[PDB]
């Protein structure tokens, strides 16, 4: 729900929105715009950055935009005085050539 | 002695020799009881094989200790290394022959001590400085500043407590008007056992002797299953055994003195059984500490330093002073009796809520 004001935004910014029928969601971003976007989220009341899973798609039986892909899991702890349980992933495909990305 | 026996140089020697090795065998079988009594205490079977009751296991242990490398490591000096345990054991051994074992001229008619002096208290007090010497020396010897630092803690603390023991021993000297053991014993022979007379001095003494090396403040860092004492872990074989040995010898020495002091060792108007009565008092306190030792914790020396220094020692000399007032005007000693008893009663009542 905290999520939703992110979602309309994401849609507005045209970011592709992955969804598994298991109700897991990724948001496909470029590298550049990430940091700030993600800044805005914490501000928007995102409690808890749970994960960073680095992905190697060296060999995959389908095409992907990039070989290296990061994925953040952000969460809103509802058991905290703020939060809604709003948990979602952000995926960001990553050039192999530059293994860079601004921290969080 | 000005009214007490003497015996040949030879007989003196024999008694000494015996008493030394007696305390070896003592230490051995003490370990056994400690191990087994520990097991049982924490509902467990123990040494029972190689015995029966693990009897011969200490032999094995000793034998293990020998036939080993026993070397000095680089960045230490040889002489110091050798001396540093040595010292501690000599002076641990030393001081026990002072104390009796029974009524006068009654160790088969021969005197029930190995030395007896005329100056009891002093000797004890004096010996108390010399163990800690061994300790810190070892630290330094080892050449790890890690070892050293532990030893500094140790010694510092020990020495702090050492002083309170001093303030304790004045008090009975008042009462008897003397410091030799025999007379002191005999004082209780008429009036009764000395803790009656001065329960808080009994008390404060008791808890100060805890503060002896005895594995019973039970952090120091002690060695065996914590951050270690620096008098160990930079040691090897037999030398290591010696240190361990020493700690225990202290333990029992202290356990003996407390009977000496507050009871007579073998005074008991009910019956005279010399040797028996000695052991029984020993036994009591022995177990008593061990029960504490078990069921109570490792104590940060930080806490301890705060604890003894600020509260415990000042209250002990305070009690002395009071008693000195009474004694100076030489008033009914009944007058202390009430109070001693009461203070305990107070401080006992204080436990529960």
């Amino acid at each position: 729900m905290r999520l939703e004001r992110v979602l309309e935004e994401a849609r507005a910014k045209g970011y592709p929105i992955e969804d598994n029928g298991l109700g897991n969601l990724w948001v496909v971003l470029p590298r550049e715009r990430f940091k700030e976007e993600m800044a805005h989220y914490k501000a928007m009341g995102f409690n808890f950055l749970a994960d960073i899973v680095g992905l190697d798609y060296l060999t995959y039986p389908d095409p992907r935009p990039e070989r290296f892909a990061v994925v953040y899991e952000l969460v809103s702890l509802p058991g905290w005085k703020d939060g809604d349980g709003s948990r979602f992933f952000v995926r960001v495909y990553v050039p192999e050539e530059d293994p860079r990305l601004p921290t969080v | 002695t000005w009214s007490y026996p003497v015996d040949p140089y030879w007989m003196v020697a024999l008694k000494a020799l015996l008493v030394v090795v007696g305390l070896l065998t003592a230490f051995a079988f003490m370990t056994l009881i400690e191990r087994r009594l520990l097991a049982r205490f924490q509902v467990r079977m123990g040494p029972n094989r190689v015995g029966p009751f693990g009897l011969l296991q200490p032999l094995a242990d000793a034998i293990k200790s020998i036939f080993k490398e026993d070397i000095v490591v680089a960045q230490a000096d040889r002489f110091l290394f050798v001396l540093a345990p040595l010292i501690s054991v000599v002076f641990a051994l030393l001081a026990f022959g002072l104390i009796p074992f029974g009524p006068p001229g009654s160790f088969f008619g021969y005197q029930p001590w190995v030395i007896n002096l005329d100056l009891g208290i002093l000797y004890l007090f004096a010996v108390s400085e010399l163990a800690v010497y061994g300790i810190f020396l070892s630290g330094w010897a080892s050449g790890s500043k890690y070892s050293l630092l532990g030893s500094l803690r140790s010694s510092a603390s020990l020495i702090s407590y050492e002083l309170g023991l001093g303030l304790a021993l004045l008090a009975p000297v008042l009462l008897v008007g003397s410091l030799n053991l025999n007379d002191i014993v005999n004082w209780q022979k008429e009036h009764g056992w000395l803790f009656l007379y001065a329960f808080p001095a009994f008390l404060v003494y008791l808890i100060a002797s805890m503060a002896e090396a005895a594995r019973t403040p039970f952090d120091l860092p002690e060695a065996e299953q914590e951050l270690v004492g620096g008098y160990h872990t930079e040691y090897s074989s037999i030398k290591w055994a010696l240190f361990q040995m020493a700690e225990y010898i202290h333990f029992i020495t202290a356990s003996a003195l407390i009977p000496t002091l507050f009871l007579g060792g073998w005074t008991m108007p009910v019956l005279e059984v010399p040797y028996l009565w000695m052991f029984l008092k020993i036994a009591f306190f022995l177990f008593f500490f061990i029960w504490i030792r078990a069921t109570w914790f490792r104590l940060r020396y930080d806490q301890l330093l705060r604890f003894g220094w600020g509260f415990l020692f000042p209250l002990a000399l305070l009690w002395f002073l009071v008693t000195a007032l009474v004694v100076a005007l030489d008033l009914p000693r009944t007058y202390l009796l009430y109070l001693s008893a009461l203070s305990f009663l107070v401080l006992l009542g204080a436990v529960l809520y």
Binding site: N20, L22, N24, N47, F48, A50, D51, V53, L55, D56, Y60, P61, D62, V71, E73, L77, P78, G79, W80, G85, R87, F89 | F41, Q42, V43, R44, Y146, D219, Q225, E226, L227, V228, A294, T295, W296, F297, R298, L299, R300, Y301, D302, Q303
Partner: protein
């Protein structure tokens, strides 16, 4: 000075190399240096089957083994959409909570051992044995288990399981109390613990701490409530909480948990009756072996299952769960092979360790030992 506390010491048995910047009488900061063990399970398991991976799951949690296992199980189960019988699910919670108790037993056992008085450990261990005896019964294994199987556990409970289970629930309340009895009074207990273990709730999240650290600071955050997963929805129980980050608080929490766990057991026993123990879709489940005798199609599927093992469809999956040790979860990408294309493990304790230089700011030197211990290191999280 920068003091170097190396691995395997003294009986704290983290691989721990610790650079303690000291004032020579205080701790300033610790730069922990770790990672002296590691495997790369995550790698290896892409080179084993899904079935096989279940071997790996309890092999990185000495404590609550079954939780890892469960969490991994769930993830798979979700992915191909498989369901689990109610009775199965009953059993699963029972084992889980039994394993939680185990964990706690070990936590406090070590707590005592680490420092403070040594002995009560042995009593807590007596109980642990009892627990172990229960595990032995049902899984033939002291610990590590495979009883849980896909679709639900792989065979029925012992009858023998019922007597003993009651039995130990009788004894434990009283026992639990008596361990607790050692702590809350002992004014020395106070003087060793209360002041230390500090960290703001705010920073607990920033540096990442998980329940029984976070909830050790009394911040309600049961993942079993927040993302309630199976059965727990329909089980009452409450959250045990502290109200500040200290050792002191932690310790008491755990005791309360155990009691909650026991009530859940109690609840469970009521809800227990006959039923199939795993999913009866033989496509996705290995078939009963009492039927090889019978059909070919059985034989075929059987053979196949235990050789090749199925193909789940393509997908990533994650489920958050509440382990004993905190936020647990597996992020699993499968490419639809017979092995996954990614096994990410969410290891809580590892993240919880990040908060150590913080946790151990400006502390006192004998205290620093305990402050590590109090947080609970299982090195598997860290090392992986």
């Amino acid at each position: 000075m920068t003091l170097n506390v190396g691995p395997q010491h003294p009986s704290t048995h983290g691989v721990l190399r610790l650079m303690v910047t000291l004032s020579g009488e205080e701790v300033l900061e610790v730069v922990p240096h770790i990672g002296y063990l590691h495997t790369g399970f995550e790698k290896t398991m892409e080179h084993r089957t899904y079935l096989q991976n279940i071997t790996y799951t309890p092999r990185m949690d000495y404590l609550h083994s079954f939780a890892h296992d469960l969490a991994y199980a769930l993830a798979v189960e979700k992915l191909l959409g498989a369901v689990v019988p109610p009775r199965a699910e009953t059993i699963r919670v029972i084992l889980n909570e039994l394993s939680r108790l185990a964990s706690h037993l070990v936590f406090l056992g070590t707590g005592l051992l680490d420092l403070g008085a040594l002995t009560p450990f042995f009593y807590a261990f007596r109980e642990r044995e009892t627990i172990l005896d229960l595990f032995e019964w049902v899984t033939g294994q002291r610990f590590h288990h495979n009883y849980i199987r896909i679709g639900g556990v792989k065979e029925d409970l012992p009858e023998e399981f019922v007597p003993e289970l009651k039995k130990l629930l009788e004894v434990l309340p009283h026992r639990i109390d008596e361990y607790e009895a050692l702590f809350a009074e002992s004014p020395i207990f106070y003087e060793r613990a209360r002041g230390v273990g500090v960290i703001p709730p705010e920073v607990a999240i920033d540096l990442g701490l998980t329940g029984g650290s976070l909830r050790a600071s009394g911040v309600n955050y049961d993942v079993r409530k927040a993302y309630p997963y199976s059965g727990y929805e329909t089980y009452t129980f409450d959250v045990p909480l502290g109200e500040r980050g200290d050792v002191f608080d932690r310790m008491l929490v755990r005791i309360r948990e155990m009691r909650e766990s026991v009530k859940i057991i109690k609840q469970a026993l009521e809800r227990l009756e006959p039923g199939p123990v795993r999913d009866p879709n033989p496509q996705i489940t290995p078939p009963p072996r009492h039927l090889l005798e019978t059909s070919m199609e059985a034989v075929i599927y059987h053979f196949k299952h235990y050789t090749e093992g199925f193909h789940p469809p393509k997908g990533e999956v994650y489920v958050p769960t509440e382990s004993a040790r905190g936020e647990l979860g597996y992020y699993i990408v499968s490419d639809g092979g017979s092995m996954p294309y990614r096994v990410k493990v969410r290891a809580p304790s590892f993240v919880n360790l990040q908060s150590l230089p913080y946790a151990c700011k400006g502390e006192q030197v004998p205290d620093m030992v305990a402050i590590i211990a109090s947080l609970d290191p299982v090195m598997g999280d860290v090392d992986r």
